[PDB]
Amino acid sequence: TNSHGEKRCTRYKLQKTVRERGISPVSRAIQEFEEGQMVHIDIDPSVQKGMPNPKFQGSTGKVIGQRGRSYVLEVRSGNAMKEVFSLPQHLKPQKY
Amino acid sequence: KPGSMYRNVRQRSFTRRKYMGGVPGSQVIHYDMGDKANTSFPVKISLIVEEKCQIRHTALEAARITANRHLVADTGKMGFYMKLRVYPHEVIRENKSGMRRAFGKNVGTAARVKPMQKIFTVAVEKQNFKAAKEALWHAGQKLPTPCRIVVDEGAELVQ
Amino acid sequence: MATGPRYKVPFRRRREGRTNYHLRLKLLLSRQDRVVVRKSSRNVQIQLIAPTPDGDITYSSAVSNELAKYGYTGATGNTTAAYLTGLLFGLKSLQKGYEGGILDIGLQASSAGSRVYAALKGVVDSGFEIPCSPEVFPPDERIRGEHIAGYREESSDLPEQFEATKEKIFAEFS
Amino acid sequence: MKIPKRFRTYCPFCKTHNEVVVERVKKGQASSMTHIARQKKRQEGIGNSGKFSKVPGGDKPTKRIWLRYRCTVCKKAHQRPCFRAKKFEFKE
Amino acid sequence: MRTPIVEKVIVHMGVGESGQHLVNAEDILRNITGQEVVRCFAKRTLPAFSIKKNEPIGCKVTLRGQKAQEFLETALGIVEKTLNRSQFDSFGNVSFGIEEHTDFPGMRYDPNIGVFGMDVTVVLKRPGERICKRRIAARKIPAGHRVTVDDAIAFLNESYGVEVM
RNA sequence: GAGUUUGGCGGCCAUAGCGGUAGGGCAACUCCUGUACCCAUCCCGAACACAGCAGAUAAGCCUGCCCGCGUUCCUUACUGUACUGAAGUGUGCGAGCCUUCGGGAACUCUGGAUCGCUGCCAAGCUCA
RNA sequence: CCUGGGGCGGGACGCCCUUGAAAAGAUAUCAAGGGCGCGCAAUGGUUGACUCAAGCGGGUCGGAAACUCGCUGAAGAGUGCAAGAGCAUAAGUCAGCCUGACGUUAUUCAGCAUAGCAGUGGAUGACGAGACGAAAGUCGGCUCUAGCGAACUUUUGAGCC
RNA sequence: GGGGUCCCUCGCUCGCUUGUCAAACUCCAAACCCCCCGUCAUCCUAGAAAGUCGGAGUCCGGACUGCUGGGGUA
Ligand SMILES: [Mg+2]
Ligand SMILES: [Zn+2]
């Protein structure tokens, strides 16, 4: 039977491209975010700590608070609001 | 087991042989026939299929045998070059009880070919064009698809 | 040798062997200015750096070429010159409005009584705040330049000129 | 596996790190004056006794290695959620 | 600044086992080298030697500077200044073999120890090859700056007088 | 007030890599020189560390060049092809496929470009 | 109990990974590939120093089988074990020092999308103690995802009612 | 490495040019689709989104058009 683990069916959700494999840009890991700012969840597979679910990969979260290094995001999953803790390595700002 | 069983293409490609078990290999022996060195054949024709069909390896071997024998008896042993382009990569599995645990065992391979995809390419001289064309006609009678011949090289050389 | 399209070239600083990015990620998590001390074979240089996504920016700096104007004549690439450069950097950064920062020796190896730790002791003695352990500090006679008697008698001008430069720079910035 | 007989860890009572001696916990004999023994004596009569006629169940493939970490300073031992192992020995 | 100067001298003793023999090997290597000598560990176990993984097999020493120059002069003396082109590497780093440590004067043969042959190799580089070894901004040396085999034999003839044929 | 060079820290992480040729250093950098000391070798002052007068731009480095390999981009053709969103009293014995409106490749090909761009600070010089 | 009727066979009866699955999420079958019910005081933590697999070249019966030197080498190795993902001045290897394989405690995830649901984990934190380190940091075991179990009962640990 | 002075036969192995593939392959890569922002549109104080409570039924479904859906000779 199939499993129910957190990494289930994440062969390409949590995979890095060939020319971004290895160390990531360190400037992405100290990008400070403001209160209420909209940020995109684009999970960095190399950074194995503070990662959200693969189910939130590609969702825009509204920053509502900080819990140390990571940020608190109000993410939408279908019809429910979720609080998704993610470090700045996995987040990316939305530009207008 | 007639070819009508494993003919229609309604299933995905079952070719990754490291995740299956014990495929009986194809009976197809060769894929190049005739002069495998003379690249200077002016008139070149190809047998193309005009449906989406799965050709069994036994069908491919029978077609190759009839076409090669006709070409050897028509244009001599070294007066032609005939190429079977497609390898049988798909593995054909039969549910050898009832429908419980229906994923069958591999009972042979086959080649999945698209419409207008060339099966046999034949290169011949000017005078041996008709014999090569007629042998390719006999080759497609052993295949499960409607087949039409198309001329690759020397369209002006014939008419 | 980028043999094909599946070749991952290192980053440009890593290709040039000039920056470690794992150490850079470790240091940038502090959210504090870095005391980027770099030593050259003929003199020493110290910077205060704060990163922004456009690139690093440097607030204050100080090299061994500035020690001439304060009355220094000896070698600019020894422990004494490193200490004087660190003290000048600390006083100048205090004057500009910076008093904190974590040490950053980068790719340079860590060993007690080096020129980098001499510059660190110079920065600490100027009032600039930087977390450090006194084990890696050099002895006071080494900062004075008490090596002189081994090889050369023309090195004997070092300690008096070091003390003179120290008092001059302290009067200059305070 | 192996765990040292003595190693320095955290004593939650003295609230400091100290050398602790590890001792295997001994499953004690069941007391005959507990409330369940009195209830079992009170439920014995003619016929089935319910939970006291049950034969106790089997065992897991590997039991946990039940260990106690007695502090060497204040002597107060504590015990923590222990690993599960087949063969256990003490390194000295 | 193109002279292929002697970067280092390498000496190795392929004992092939350990016990008393390897200790005697490292002791005599230290005696004839004038420098502390380290051993070597087998990478995998092979029943033909009957060796085991992570088991000491041989001993090696790295010689530099005037010690390297004097030891290489002694090795050239034992070889009688004779060497052929096949010894040289593709980049001029030579390596040859000797079969008797008693060829070295100053050391007395012992009946227990026997005769030992040690493989010596000296690497020849150019003044500026430190860039590929340092820790600050290490870069690869190009093809032009490297040392050719003919330049190596020319250097060995001019500095050591070893004719290579 | 501005510019060139040099150094440190970088951002984007190959348009930046791999490879080949031609030029330069006053200041700088490097190579390079020793081992009293600080520090160090699973041995070697090789690296690190320290103290540096020389000598050398031969390499690091900088400038220009070469389409050769890789990458990226445009370009003509393949081609509005493949594939596909919607609808269809359109069609095939069947596996299926067609028309309309709306999107739209990849490979290859033609002719070309790309042998990095840029941010901060400091040292110098040359400002009008 | 499931079950292309039931039975025989099997466990698709608990947990984990790839495809199926139609490029958000979800998605069944006795669907396909399978694995787990463990091992480890180091096969763990941290700092420093290095880089691996495999080729070509040189070295003496040390053979085309050992060990050693140079060159190519973004990984073709290793990381305990399924599968997938991660990693190169390293998440690998070696060595120094250590025991964070620490006591207590709060949230949100995901088992269980949407959308209730057990004991459990797994990511952020907090209080108190440390280890290594110049410091930044890292350490709540072994790179991430399996290795396990309610109520009742008994035993044990510290102090109390 | 295989065969009738290891004289020479010679299959694998490595490059240039061809011929085919993948559901557990990807240097590439759509159209749908999903999160967020702006705009228009529609709903909305005659009550948006949210919340609390009362009442259930329901967990035998089936079909048409697509996904070459999976399995199957069908
Ligand atoms: Mg039943
Ligand atoms: Zn205690």
Residue numbers in the entry:
A (entry chain BR): 2 to 97
B (entry chain BI): 4 to 99, 111 to 173
C (entry chain BN): 1 to 174
D (entry chain Bf): 1 to 92
E (entry chain BF): 1 to 165
What does the paper say about this structure?
Optimal yield of 70S ribosome particles from methanol-grown cells enabled cryo-EM density map reconstruction at a resolution of 2.92 Å, allowing detailed analysis of RNA posttranscription modifications, as well as the secondary and tertiary structures of ribosomal RNAs, the composition of r-proteins and their interactions. Although the ribosomes were isolated using a simple sucrose cushion method, we did not observe any cryo-EM density in the 70S ribosome corresponding to tRNA or mRNA in the intersubunit space between the 50S and 30S subunits. We identified 24 and 30 annotated r-proteins in the 30S and 50S subunits of the M. acetivorans ribosome, respectively, and a putative zinc finger domain-containing protein aS21. The 30S subunit showed modest resolution, ranging 3.0 Å to 6.5 Å, due to its inherent mobility relative to 50S subunit. To improve the quality of the 30S, we used particle subtraction to computationally remove the 50S subunit, followed by local 3D refinement of the 30S subunit. This approach improved the overall resolution of 30S subunit to 3.11 Å. M. acetivorans ribosome has a simplified r-protein composition. In contrast, the M. acetivorans ribosome contains only a single eL8, which binds to a conserved AUGUG motif in the 23S rRNA. The number of protein-RNA contacts for a given 50S protein ranged from as few as three to as many as 27. The three proteins with the most RNA contacts were L37AE (10 contacts), eL19 (12 contacts), and uL2 (27 contacts), which are highlighted on the 70S structure from methanol. Proteins L37AE, eL19, and uL2 coordinate the 30S, forming the intersubunit bridge.
